[PDB]
Amino acid sequence: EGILDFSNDLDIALLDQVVSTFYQGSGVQQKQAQEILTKFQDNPDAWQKADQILQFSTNPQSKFIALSILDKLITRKWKLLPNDHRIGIRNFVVGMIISMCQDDEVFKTQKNLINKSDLTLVQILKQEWPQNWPEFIPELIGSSSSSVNVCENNMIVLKLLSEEVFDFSAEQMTQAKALHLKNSMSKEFEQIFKLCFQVLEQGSSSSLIVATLESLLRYLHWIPYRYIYETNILELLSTKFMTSPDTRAITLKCLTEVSNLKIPQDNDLIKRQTVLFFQNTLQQIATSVMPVTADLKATYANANGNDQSFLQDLAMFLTTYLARNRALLESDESLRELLLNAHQYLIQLSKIEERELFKTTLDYWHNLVADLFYEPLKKHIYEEICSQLRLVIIENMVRPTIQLYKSEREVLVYLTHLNVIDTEEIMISKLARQIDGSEWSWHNINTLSWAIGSISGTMSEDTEKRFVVTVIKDLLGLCEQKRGKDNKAVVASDIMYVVGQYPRFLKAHWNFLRTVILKLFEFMHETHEGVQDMACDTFIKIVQKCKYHFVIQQPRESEPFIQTIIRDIQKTTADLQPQQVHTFYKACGIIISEERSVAERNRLLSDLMQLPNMAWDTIVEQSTANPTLLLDSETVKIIANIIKTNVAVCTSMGADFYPQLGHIYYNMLQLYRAVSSMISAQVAAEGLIATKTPKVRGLRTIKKEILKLVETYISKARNLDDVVKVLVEPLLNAVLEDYMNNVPDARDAEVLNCMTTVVEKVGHMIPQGVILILQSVFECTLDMINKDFTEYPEHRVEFYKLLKVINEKSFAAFLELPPAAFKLFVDAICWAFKHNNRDVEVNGLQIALDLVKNIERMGNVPFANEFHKNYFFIFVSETFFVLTDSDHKSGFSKQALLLMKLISLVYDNKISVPLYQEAEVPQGTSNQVYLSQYLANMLSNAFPHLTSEQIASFLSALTKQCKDLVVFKGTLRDFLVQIKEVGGDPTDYLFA
């Protein structure tokens, strides 16, 4: 800890050892050196000793750390330095870099230090160039002819400069500073390009060539196209630098970016050049790297050298170029072989086992086959490409990532439309190779079944019929021939998967559909792992698409099949787990909602709900006398499962569920009360730990499922009058006081969520109900969540969702709060601003914006006037604080919008009363003048290192731009840059 003492002289030998203990040590000694170096680096005067380290040290890591300390200085305090320190650092860095390039030992073995020095120089150029350094580029080009190490290193400096100016400036500098630097680079690029082009043509140092090509990759992001097309550089890139593997990787990335240049789409000479560099590139690949027939899947899997990165970059080059320019190659007959070879390389690249690479090629195939589906006279070019692609995608079909599956299905569907016959043949052939065993595998049969199911709905109905029948026959034959339950279960699951994917086929063949369903019922008794889950998932899947054929009476039948399903439901589901039974009931609910005869639908609902209703009446009877039964876990599980069944059926039936809800509603809410008592009694007998017990958790599950049922119906109800007149009143009496009067750890956050749904759907109709909801949950929930940002995370999120919807639908409820409670409301909104939690922060900002709009709509009334007097500047300053504290960057856009709304209120004279105290400012002073004075004083105290000119210029632009959000936000972003440094140019705020 001696080096931290700046009283004495810095012990360079001790520094080199502290640095060594950190990088090469371990244990507590490395951890102690870590805290020391961080403190040494953070000392605001350590930059003064940085010239000693860079001159005297023998440890390259110490010189790196010194350049970092310098970098902090150049980045944040460069303008506060006396003008001669600025000259010395600049001279020292320039001189040190010159010396390092002369010592071939240093230039060869200290690349990290030279790169770090080159970046530090670039930081100086951003501050000083070109206004205080106009001959840099001329002197850079002159010194490049002296040494090869200097020419190469100057390419590294130019590369980094291009990156800092064009690639990474938007966030890190003001708009004016960025534009200034872009214009400066643009004015002097002609000299940069000629030096760059001379090196590429004259050879011969490969490291110099690679560094020159790496800088060219950066230039291509922004330079005008004439530099690429009106010189010979494309020929060089597409021929010379493709042969040598040292330059090949970077050249390929350059050509990829060349394929993205903005280029006139009408000049025929340029179209020739765009064709020509592609033809050269593909020729160098065929002759110098690998022929189009090579097995790229195996090459990639071998992972020799840089092969994987090269094949990735080749896929990027081909897909990028062909997506933009393949029309250039499609009409000329002399270009047909070049077009198909390029796509054949893509075909080979698409067989590589690499998920992220496959998605990249798949995105191109999607682009292609969509174009062959819509554009005239094109698909004939690519039929042999498309035929191979069918096999590639069928054989790589993934389980339905679902995102990758949807992309694969979309391409395979396009390819089925393009040639149905070829698609059938490949799939039946693949199936034949499953049957003869050459490609038999659980993974392989599953993958093929997914592919066969994916193209459902693309063939004609009759062609599809014969396809499906062939597949089902072969799959049934494959099952018969296999031995063992393991193998037979795999095929049967795939058989059910395929049929579930073809509802148009099922709907036209009722006898087969019924056989399917009865088979699924058979499988609900199969103990084998996964079969019951497959049987239930297939059952509801088929029901969703074919429900109408279960509700009507089918020819040659005595009753709609739904009546047959309900009749045998106990036998069918007897071996299923509870969650599987609920899926079954949910499926029946789908079917019943197809019946639009009200009387017949309610009767089906009654019959379906017969078993849960009978088990419900018994429990309501026997658990009311006497409430000891609810201590029995078995009774709690039966109640939870009854309610969950009701949720499942209500989920699919929605508005139609109301008759069944009425059958249980009043006894359910009584049960809710009785369960609430036992939770409360249990917390009294055993303490807060009781809430963790299985007994209480089972009881709270009953309450949670009851709320979820009520929530599910109300969110889907169509008769809102019955909701208000029949449902809302008993619901509030059952849940509100129980929530308010429980200890925090016993309050169910689901109560808030349920209330959110109620207010969302019928809030405009129950103003007194909304007030009672606020009175019961507002202050007690706020006290739970306003001591930190951690505790009660669910209550935190539901709380602000509830406040948000109350503010949208029943704002009058907040108007009836006592002034002390309305003040807690404002506090709660600002409290939400400060959350890093995205759910809280977004809602809190939205509530603030909707609240200001709610106040604006009131007009010139005493409540609106008092609101602005009491809370306008609180909202302005709380918004500025999260805008500027660097810990709420995710909410910038909505902070900016809320702030623009607050500022525009004043510059539109929408605030009637004066915002100030009548003594603190002369009478008749406009709110605008007072607003600019308040903000100036606020920012001056919050950011004391800013000049008054900065603050005034920023605020002048900000207020003048409060009708132009894109510009307003740019000005905020400029302010956020200037507060991170000293000496920001106040004229930057005149950018727009």
């Binding site: 049934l476 037979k488 006898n511 087969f512 088979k519």
Partner: peptide, 16 residues
Amino acid sequence: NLNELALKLAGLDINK
């Protein structure tokens, strides 16, 4: 109709 196809499916027994 597909009565024979339905008969095969109905027969299906993963335990045989």
